[PDB]
């Protein structure tokens, strides 16, 4: 067991519970503390961020942040799960118009609300014959198979998923996802060449302040950040007039914690990497 801080932006694989894939990674991280930040769909593929050591104490930003998802239904079919596996309980021929299709997307995207919320953008990919594909960002809380279900009905004809990917968590890269068996990959490469699988693992982390990506970023000099390190609010050009932010220091931009813009317009300590002494 090694203390390991980083955010590994995993590829789930479809079908398998974000804890199985939370407990394969820390293994192969061979890390102390891990967590993911949010259960993803067992039947949907795609970006799982696992939090690795400290990581895990910002896990909560992460949890309330957009996400973004590659959709396909099954038009024409309403299910008993809103998805693929499972019987039909409802088919009805597809006689909608792209006119129809194109209003009853638009009355998906903004502000709307939900009953089993926003969604910033709504991409129409295509629609053909019983298909619909789109892509979903959307804000927290948001459930991709009731907007389906509902659009299946608006449409008259239902709707299921049969396809259900998360493209990506907050602003994290796409193309930072890595899959387990390109990790079980470079564990053999590093067995081969007889260095620490971590040599090779380490690199594909994110930083351990990336679950806070939606907060901007606040530098402060050594000088300032001894005051915040210790509990104390500190006064620093940059900083946003309002909201959380996370706080840096030095030269090389050590993450140091959250911190909050109070009331007087300082930034003060929120959530610290270190303790307060007694």
Do not use: W
Not at 53 to 63: D, I, P, R, V
Not at 137 to 153: A, M, N, P, Q, V
Not at 202 to 221: E, G, K, R
Request: glycine share 8%.
């Amino acid at each position: 067991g090694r203390d390991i801080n980083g955010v590994l932006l995993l590829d789930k694989p479809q079908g398998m519970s974000s804890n199985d894939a939370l407990q394969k990674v820390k293994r192969i991280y061979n890390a102390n503390r891990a967590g993911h930040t949010g259960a993803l769909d067992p039947l949907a593929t795609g970006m799982l961020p696992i939090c690795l050591g400290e990581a895990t104490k910002f896990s909560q930003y992460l949890l309330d942040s957009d996400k973004r998802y590659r959709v396909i239904a099954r038009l024409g079919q309403r299910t008993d799960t809103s998805d693929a596996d499972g019987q039909i309980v409802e088919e009805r021929p597809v006689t909608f118009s792209a006119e129809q299709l194109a209003a009853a997307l638009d009355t998906f995207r903004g502000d709307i609300e939900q009953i089993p919320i926003t969604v910033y953008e709504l991409l129409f990919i295509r629609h053909e014959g019983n298909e619909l594909e789109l892509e979903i960002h959307c804000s927290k809380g948001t459930y991709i198979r009731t907007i389906i279900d509902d659009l299946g009905e608006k449409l008259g004809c239902g709707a299921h998923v049969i396809y259900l990917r998360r493209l990506a968590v907050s602003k994290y890269p796409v193309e930072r996802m890595v899959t387990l068996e390109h990790l079980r990959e470079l564990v053999e490469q590093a067995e081969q060449q007889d260095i620490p699988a971590a040599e090779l693992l380490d690199p594909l982390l994110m930083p351990m302040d990336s679950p806070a990506s939606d907060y901007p970023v606040v530098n402060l000099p050594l000088t300032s950040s001894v005051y915040f390190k210790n509990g104390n609010p500190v006064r620093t050009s940059g900083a946003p007039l309002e909201g959380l932010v996370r706080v840096t220091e030095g030269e090389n931009g050590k993450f140091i914690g959250m911190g909050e813009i109070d009331d007087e317009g300082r930034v003060a300590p929120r959530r610290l990497v270190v303790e307060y002494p007694a």
